[PDB]
Design a protein around this ligand. Structure first.
Ligand SMILES: *C(=O)N1C[C@H](NOS(=O)(=O)O)CC[C@H]1C(=O)NNC(=O)C1CNC1
Ligand SMILES: *C(=O)N1C[C@H](NOS(=O)(=O)O)CC[C@H]1C(=O)NNC(=O)C1CNC1
Ligand SMILES: [Cl-]
Ligand SMILES: [Co+2]
Ligand SMILES: [Co+2]
Ligand SMILES: [Co+2]
Ligand SMILES: [Co+2]
Ligand SMILES: [Co+2]
Ligand SMILES: [Co+2]
Lengths: 243, 243
């Protein structure tokens, strides 16, 4: 996988006063682009972007039966209001409801977790730390370019889980759709261990191609979180991928 | 299935110089609403809304392998320019490419098609006419209320085809998605037999409920086609289903 540098995209980071990386993979051409080859390959904690593999494993093992199964709020009031209510896989992804995913992780267990992440070739494949938080403050790392490798397999149903688990997760990833494009993606925010960064990884489906993407950026406070999507879209617009 | 009448929705037809019906079903409450009870139960040719069951049958029998298989343009130039190109299941639904679905129907054949439509309880279950056009100018008829019953089964994976088939077709029905709702639906326009009518059928998925919809409206010319979605959405908005 060759990655071409296109530094012009820095204008969209510079302009919004930020630092980060966007990586793009054109599936038809089998060609990648990024504004920063080095940061493209730097490995960070995935945080809530871990919800993709975690969902896949939970489904494949039967921890999650289907996307309608309800995970009842455990009654503990937390900082984010949308977390304080019953959820299913679709809403748990949408609102990035960590407790629901920590419970999945505990049920998966560390042996099946580790074996699954080897099968997925996910990041550095290291789950050291708590079984229910390693992807937040444990030993797992993944780079932007590794997110794309992982996501390309998901897209083509090539991960070592059932096709059904893959289709369900790609349904749960649905973020936006209109008559020009479909975006399936997952955000994240790694606060718990420096450096604080925001992630957005996914792809955009066109009629006759797909463009995978993974971006991360410095995120000292929650106030810049909207820039994850906003900057990614600025780059997609520049590259004529979306209107 | 009980239906309440709500005549106030007629203002959205009237203001657009139109006549038709919108039928809504609230899944959590198991209640239906419509502006016109009679027309809600009046059965019409399904035209392009038949691509939903046709897709399901074609996938279940392996006539279509999956949503990436390419159906090469047959080289015949037709009125609608988007048809004169290669397609897959996703784009063939999106651009409502009749000739791709006529090939499906020919390969499915009369005997399996009839069995499938009985299994589906699809309208009057009658496939009289050409095997490659009966849903356009043959004997099959379905009402908007019957479209809802059928779609509810699809939603719940209860049709007598594989779960896989139903998931692929629901993916292909994807029309719009955002932070507030997802719409999965299919348009149609029945022109070969009077009365000329436009259809839009599908559902809207919310965080905690799903609202099914089926609408048809008189359509003397193609210049009114956008009203299908526009009127439906005005109903949806009036009922606070979407903002
Ligand atoms: C993901 O990275 N998460 C979960 C949630 N996701 O929102 S988003 O980034 O997908 O929009 C909030 C941010 C992040 C965290 O979970 N970070 N915080 C914590 O887990 C709390 C316990 N220490 C703070
Ligand atoms: C569906 O009902 N079709 C196919 C295409 N539909 O687009 S939409 O209604 O989903 O937006 C065009 C309209 C319709 C027809 O096929 N209509 N007519 C015919 O196929 C023949 C009679 N003139 C050609
Ligand atoms: Cl989908
Ligand atoms: Co390995
Ligand atoms: Co190892
Ligand atoms: Co190793
Ligand atoms: Co493929
Ligand atoms: Co109105
Ligand atoms: Co169900």
């Amino acid at each position: 996988k060759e990655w071409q540098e296109n530094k012009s995209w820095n204008a969209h980071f510079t302009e919004h006063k930020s630092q980060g990386v966007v990586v793009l993979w054109n599936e038809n051409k089998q060609q990648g682009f990024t504004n920063n080859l080095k940061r493209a390959n730097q490995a960070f904690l995935p945080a809530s972007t871990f919800k993709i593999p975690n969902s896949l494993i939970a489904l494949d093992l039967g921890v999650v039966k289907d996307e309608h199964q309800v995970f009842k709020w455990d009654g503990q009031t937390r900082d984010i209001a949308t977390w304080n209510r019953d959820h299913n896989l679709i809403t748990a992804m949408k609102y990035s409801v960590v407790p629901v995913y920590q419970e999945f992780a505990r049920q998966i267990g560390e042996a099946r977790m580790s074996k699954m992440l080897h099968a997925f070739d996910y990041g550095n494949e290291d789950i050291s730390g708590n079984v229910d938080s390693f992807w937040l403050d444990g030993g797992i790392r993944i780079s932007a370019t590794e997110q794309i490798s992982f996501l390309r397999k998901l897209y083509h149903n090539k991960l070592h889980v059932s096709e059904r688990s893959q289709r369900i997760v790609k349904q749960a990833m649905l973020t936006e759709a209109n008559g020009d494009y479909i975006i399936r993606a997952k955000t994240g925010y790694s606060t718990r261990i420096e450096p604080k960064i925001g992630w957005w990884v996914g792809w955009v489906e066109l009629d006759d191609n797909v463009w995978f993407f993974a971006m991360n950026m410095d995120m000292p406070t929650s106030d810049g979180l909207g820039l994850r999507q906003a900057i990614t879209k600025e780059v997609l617009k520049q590259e004529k991928i979306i209107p």
